[PDB]
């Protein structure tokens, strides 16, 4: 299937638009086993993305979740 799992702002935005997610929830969507990225590279690019998006922060189950869900 031309044109897989890559850490992009587009992907993060789509996940956060669907539902609030913690940092751990998001990291689970971009597993190193699929990207081949080291844990450090993964944390670094996700940080840049989350910084730019600056998602709303909601407390759910006593835990801060990022959210672009209105």
């Amino acid at each position: 299937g031309p044109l897989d799992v890559q850490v992009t702002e587009d992907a993060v935005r789509r996940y956060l638009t669907r539902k609030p997610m913690t940092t751990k929830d998001l990291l689970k969507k971009f597993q190193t086993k699929k990207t081949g990225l080291s844990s450090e590279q993964t944390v670094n690019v996700l940080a840049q993305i989350l910084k730019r998006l600056n998602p709303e922060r909601k407390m759910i189950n006593d835990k801060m979740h990022f959210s672009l869900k209105e």
Partner: peptide, 18 residues
């Protein structure tokens, strides 16, 4: 877990780390 470590590292990174 490793996910837990990465999450702390990400959250700490958001505090303007590396």
């Amino acid at each position: 877990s490793e996910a837990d470590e990465m999450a702390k590292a990400l959250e700490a990174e958001l505090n303007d780390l590396m």
